[PDB]
Amino acid sequence: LITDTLSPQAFEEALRAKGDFYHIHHPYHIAMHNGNATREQIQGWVANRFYYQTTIPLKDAAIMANCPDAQTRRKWVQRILDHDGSHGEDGGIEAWLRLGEAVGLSRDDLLSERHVLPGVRFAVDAYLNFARRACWQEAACSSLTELFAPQIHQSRLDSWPQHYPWIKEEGYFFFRSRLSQANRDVEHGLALAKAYCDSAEKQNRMLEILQFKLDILWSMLDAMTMAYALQRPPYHTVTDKAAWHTTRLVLEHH
Amino acid sequence: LITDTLSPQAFEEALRAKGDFYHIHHPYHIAMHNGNATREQIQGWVANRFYYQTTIPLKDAAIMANCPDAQTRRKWVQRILDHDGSHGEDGGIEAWLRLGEAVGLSRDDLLSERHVLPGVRFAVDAYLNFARRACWQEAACSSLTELFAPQIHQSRLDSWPQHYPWIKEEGYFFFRSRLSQANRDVEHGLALAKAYCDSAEKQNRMLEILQFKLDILWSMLDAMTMAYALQRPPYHTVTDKAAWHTTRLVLEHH
Numbered sequence: 348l349i350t351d352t353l354s355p356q357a358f359e360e361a362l363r364a365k366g367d368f369y370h371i372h373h374p375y376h377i378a379m380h381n382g383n384a385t386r387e388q389i390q391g392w393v394a395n396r397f398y399y400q401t402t403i404p405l406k407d408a409a410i411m412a413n414c415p416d417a418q419t420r421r422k423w424v425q426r427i428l429d430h431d432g433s434h435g436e437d438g439g440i441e442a443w444l445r446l447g448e449a450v451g452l453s454r455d456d457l458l459s460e461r462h463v464l465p466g467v468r469f470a471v472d473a474y475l476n477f478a479r480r481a482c483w484q485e486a487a488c489s490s491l492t493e494l495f496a497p498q499i500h501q502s503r504l505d506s507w508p509q510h511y512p513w514i515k516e517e518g519y520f521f522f523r524s525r526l527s528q529a530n531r532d533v534e535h536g537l538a539l540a541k542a543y544c545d546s547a548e549k550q551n552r553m554l555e556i557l558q559f560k561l562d563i564l565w566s567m568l569d570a571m572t573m574a575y576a577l578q579r580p581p582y583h584t585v586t587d588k589a590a591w592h593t594t595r596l597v598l599e600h601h
Numbered sequence: 602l603i604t605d606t607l608s609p610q611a612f613e614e615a616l617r618a619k620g621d622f623y624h625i626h627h628p629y630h631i632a633m634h635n636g637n638a639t640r641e642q643i644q645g646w647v648a649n650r651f652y653y654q655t656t657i658p659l660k661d662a663a664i665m666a667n668c669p670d671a672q673t674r675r676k677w678v679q680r681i682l683d684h685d686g687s688h689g690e691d692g693g694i695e696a697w698l699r700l701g702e703a704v705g706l707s708r709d710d711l712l713s714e715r716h717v718l719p720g721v722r723f724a725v726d727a728y729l730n731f732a733r734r735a736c737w738q739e740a741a742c743s744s745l746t747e748l749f750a751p752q753i754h755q756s757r758l759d760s761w762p763q764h765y766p767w768i769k770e771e772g773y774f775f776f777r778s779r780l781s782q783a784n785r786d787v788e789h790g791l792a793l794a795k796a797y798c799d800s801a802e803k804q805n806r807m808l809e810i811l812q813f814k815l816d817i818l819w820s821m822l823d824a825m826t827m828a829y830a831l832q833r834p835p836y837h838t839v840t841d842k843a844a845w846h847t848t849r850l851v852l853e854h855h
């Protein structure tokens with residue numbers, strides 16, 4: 348715990364040290380990186396991760412709704428544009444659907460969200476709900492696991508083509524696009540954290556918030572592990588069919 | 602799927618049929634029932650389930666906050682009194698603490714919430730956020746997994762003394778108390794469901810909400826399985842110490 352307020356440089360270093368807990372260290376990621384995941388494991392990952400991807404613009408809109416600073420909103424809205432795109436096959440969500448296709452899944456497989464495991468849903472919804480309820484600065488700074496994301500994107504670009512040659516090359520567009528977007532994102536996110544977190548109290552709080560975000564990512568992979576690596580998807584003792592709920596109940600009727 | 606609106610009595614039986622997915626069928630539960638769980642697994646279950654127990658009055662208050670019907674609130678508040686304890690008389694939260702002590706955990710072990718796994722936290726928090734956001738009728742009726750709870754409480758009363766004679770007698774107080782409280786609860790819950798769910802659309806939606814609830818229960822046990830049965834708690838590849846966040850970030854500063 349921080350007793351005496353860290354300088355902004357030292358606080359940055361403390362944020363960066365949290366990368367030790369990033370999901371690049373989860374066995375699910377490591378198995379994919381080393382060429383040991385099966386096609387079903389990769390498909391399940393893409394389908395489930397789509398739920399996180401389609402939640403990012405919701406979460407960013409939530410931050411904006413809580414942010415009375417127009418200068419910040421002018422910057423933050425670019426994240427929504429990056430994922431939703433402007434008119435057509437544009438943006439990140441579309442690029443993730445093309446990754447779905449590149450690994451053998453249809454657009455409907457992803458858009459229906461029917462494969463999204465409840466453990467994935469609850470972790471991702473925790474992010475959204477934090478963004479809706481916390482102060483905008485705290486919610487904005489919980490993005491800063493993006494500090495670690497270019498490394499993990501690059502890892503996939505480096506390892507997947509030779510372990511999984513069946514993944515269509517269009518599939519890699521999204522990862523490539525994030526090497527630059529994540530960096531532009533953190534330029535702002537860091538600047539904001541270093542400016543906002545100017546007391547030991549705020550610094551310790553922010554470190555716990557970043558841990559929360561790390562926990563969301565790890566928990567998504569835990570759910571995937573249980574369903575696709577360990578033969579223990581929900582209700583496996585009672586049925587061989589998917590029986591979990593498949594609806595964003597507070598945002599859609601059905 | 603219901604196409605033609607079920608009568609109230611037929612709809613009650615469709616709600617009861619969801620018990621096929623209750624967490625009494627989860628292997629974590631079955632292992633405890635069969636005498637194959639470890640003391641660590643029992644302690645972990647007690648410590649993590651305390652997070653659920655201390656969230657029940659929060660989500661019941663959330664329902665009441667959304668409920669402009671005084672008659673309903675007059676009934677619903679009994680749930681809060683049951684868990685929090687009234688006229689200073691101990692309540693269900695205190696009884697769960699005594700279950701903690703009965704399995705060798707201190708009050709501080711439970712109250713600190715330090716042992717609460719992120720996958721448990723996110724599942725439980727999903728319950729509270731649904732209760733906060735959904736219309737009160739939907740939120741109230743999501744309690745109806747209580748239909749299934751007397752059976753599981755009795756299963757523990759029946760089997761744990763044989764297998765785990767070290768669990769102190771005092772620890773069983775909570776389970777015994779719920780045999781009657783759960784029954785009284787669902788009398789009101791069923792009445793509400795049967796009065797409110799008076800179209801096929803509403804009936805199908807309610808069954809999906811009950812599934813969501815079931816998924817929460819199942820996911821809590823999935824997290825416990827990973828951590829206590831499979832040797833894969835969060836960050837196990839990185840550290841042998843607990844590193845997850847331990848704060849209800851939007852309800853407490855630290």
Ligand SMILES: O=C(O)c1cc(C(=O)O)c2c(n1)C(=O)C(=O)c1cc(C(=O)O)[nH]c1-2
Nearest residue numbers: 403439489490491492493495496499500525
């Ligand atoms: O592939 C990944 O491992 C990974 C991690 C993260 C992250 O660290 O939160 C994000 C992304 N991808 C992502 O694609 C992305 O667009 C993104 C936005 C955000 C954010 O919190 O606002 N994180 C991430």
Ligand SMILES: O=C(O)c1cc(C(=O)O)c2c(n1)C(=O)C(=O)c1cc(C(=O)O)[nH]c1-2
Nearest residue numbers: 657693743744745746747749750753754779
């Ligand atoms: O031990 C259990 O298996 C179990 C399950 C559930 C349930 O089905 O949601 C409740 C409880 N216990 C419980 O102790 C409790 O007070 C309770 C209240 C509620 C509820 O949704 O409002 N569920 C449960």
Ligand SMILES: [Cl-]
Nearest residue numbers: 493496525529
């Ligand atoms: Cl990213």
Ligand SMILES: [Cl-]
Nearest residue numbers: 747750779783
């Ligand atoms: Cl109960």
